């Protein structure tokens, strides 16, 4: 839901300004910030922005996982533009790259999104595919490494946190699904939002926990009290495990297994939902109890884990069902750590 995007409007503006500014040469724009700060979220906001669709007609999105190889990237690009990778399945990495460079030289003013860039090595390897055809081309880059950013541009964009107020509004909108918060929970809820310190991911995770918790004053203050002020430690923000655990412990045992099952895949892996359904059935997490067929019960669990926000929707079908899904890399830490204990 684009509706759920909070307070990142001037952020988007200032980024769009830097995209529109610059010479005819290829210009690369790095957005940096710690995991969960909403880099990928902002990238999507700018990608869908009317004025960016206006300036850059040729637009493409690529998720460059820490575990990505360059051959695959070129083949992904070729498939997007031509839809015929037949002849390129045995083409060498240079032949693939030159083939992409051809498409891009014939292609007009273009904008390329590279999501979760992990290294300058990867960047310099990927850059071989892009012609300096001097058409005013731009490349939007999201990364968690300030070094990566500063290598691409000396003045990278530091993604902001949310204000107390912005924190609350996101929490309310996610925790109550477009409905408004009940006044009795307002004080505890605002206290809760504050202790997130304006980290989108922390706020969205805890919304999932609160959804699952009864909308009672006592349960919310329990939470507010248990969320110590400095739970998001700068040493390990990757140790928001306690924030996750709070949401996790609220899940039925059936969903716990399904959720930890995400640990069995590689980090940041793009999972087709219908494939996951069939596998969850195989592992026997989906108990055929009552009327529910296992496929319906599996999709319900999936939809519910999406309701708890713990799983992120990557694509939807024309059905409006979940096409592909992903769990955030910080959530993978928890799934990996906890699933080695259980």
């Amino acid at each position: 839901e684009e509706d759920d995007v909070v307070g990142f409007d001037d952020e988007a503006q200032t980024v769009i300004d830097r995209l529109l500014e610059g010479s005819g040469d290829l210009e690369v724009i790095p957005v940096v910030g710690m995991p969960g700060l909403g880099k990928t979220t902002l990238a999507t906001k700018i990608f869908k922005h009317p004025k960016i669709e206006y300036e850059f007609f040729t637009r493409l999105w690529l998720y460059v996982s820490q575990s990505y190889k360059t051959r695959e990237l070129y083949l992904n690009i070729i498939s997007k533009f031509t839809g015929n990778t037949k002849h390129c399945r045995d083409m060498s990495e240079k032949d693939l790259a030159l083939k992409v460079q051809e498409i891009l030289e014939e292609g007009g003013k273009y904008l390329i999104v590279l999501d979760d860039v992990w290294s300058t090595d990867a960047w310099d390897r990927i850059k071989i595919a892009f012609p300096k055809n001097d058409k005013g081309n731009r490349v939007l880059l999201t990364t968690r490494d300030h070094r990566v950013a500063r290598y691409c541009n000396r003045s990278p964009h530091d993604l902001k946190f949310l204000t107390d107020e912005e924190s609350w509004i996101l929490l309310e909108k996610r925790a109550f699904h477009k409905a408004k918060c009940l006044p009795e929970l307002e004080t505890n809820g605002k206290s809760i939002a504050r202790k997130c310190k304006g980290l989108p991911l922390a706020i969205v995770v805890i919304a999932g926990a609160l959804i699952g918790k009864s909308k009672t004053i006592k349960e919310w203050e329990q939470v507010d009290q248990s969320v110590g002020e400095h739970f998001i430690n700068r040493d390990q923000p990757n140790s928001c495990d306690k924030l996750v655990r709070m949401s996790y412990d609220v899940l039925p045992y059936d969903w716990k297994a399904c959720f930890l099952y995400f640990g069995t895949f590689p980090r940041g892996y793009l999972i087709p939902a219908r494939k996951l359904i069939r596998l969850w059935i195989a592992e026997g997490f989906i108990q055929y109890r009552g009327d529910l067929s296992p496929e319906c019960k599996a999709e319900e669990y999936l939809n519910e884990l999406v309701n708890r926000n713990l799983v992120m929707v990557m694509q939807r079908t024309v059905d409006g069902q979940i096409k592909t899904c992903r769990v955030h890399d910080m959530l993978y830490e928890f799934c990996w750590q906890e699933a080695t204990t259980e």
Binding site: G7, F161, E166, K197
Partner: protein
């Protein structure tokens, strides 16, 4: 240090450059309305609630003598408001004074911002805030100022001075301007730069 250095003819105003970039964005729906020619009353007229800031025309005096001070009366909902001192570079959207770097602010939520003192809480960019300060809502009269000699910031609530020992403004070459940040639709403020009597008695306070 005890003699007030009044900027009586100071008023809320977007600068030529602020207006340049404000009209560079084709969105009209993101603006505050100014009650001119007074320009002391500001109203949030946007449909959707977001952080929007406005600054004064003149900056603070840069002397080592007397006090800079202004007061703000709050009308409307009076909630999600931030009052303080901002640089001219400060964005007028999606940020509040004190939150923004190099700026200091007092929030309706009850927080002093931009004051790195021992035992403070660290927020987003580990931005230093001091929590537990008096909240403010409709009908309240809030002062913000700086003792130019000691460089200590001054806040007053309905004429009562607040604990600001050790809360210093940095002595940079950059000019700081009075600034207020509104959020909710229907929020109204009126600024006092000395044109009306201050509720905090500067003569019987500093």
């Amino acid at each position: 240090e005890s003699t007030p250095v009044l900027t009586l003819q100071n008023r809320w105003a977007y600068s030529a450059r602020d207006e340049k970039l404000a009209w560079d964005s084709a969105a009209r729906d993101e603006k505050l309305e100014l009650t001119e020619p007074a320009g002391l009353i500001v109203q949030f007229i946007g449909e959707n609630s977001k952080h929007r800031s406005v600054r004064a025309k003149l900056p603070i005096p840069k002397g080592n003598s007397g006090i800079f001070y202004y007061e703000v009366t709050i009308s409307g909902d009076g909630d999600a408001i931030y009052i303080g001192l901002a640089t001219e570079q400060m964005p007028l959207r999606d940020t509040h004074v004190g939150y923004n770097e190099g700026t200091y602010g007092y929030g309706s939520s009850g927080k002093f911002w931009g004051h790195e003192v021992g035992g403070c809480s660290h927020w987003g960019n580990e931005r230093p805030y001091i929590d537990g300060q008096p909240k403010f809502d409709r009908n309240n009269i809030i002062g913000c100022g700086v003792n130019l000699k000691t460089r200590q910031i001054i806040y007053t609530h309905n004429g009562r001075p607040l604990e600001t020992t050790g809360l210093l403004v940095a002595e940079s070459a950059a000019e700081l301007y009075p600034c207020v940040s509104l959020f909710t639709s229907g929020n109204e403020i009126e600024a006092n730069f000395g044109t009306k009597p201050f509720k905090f008695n500067i003569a019987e306070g500093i």
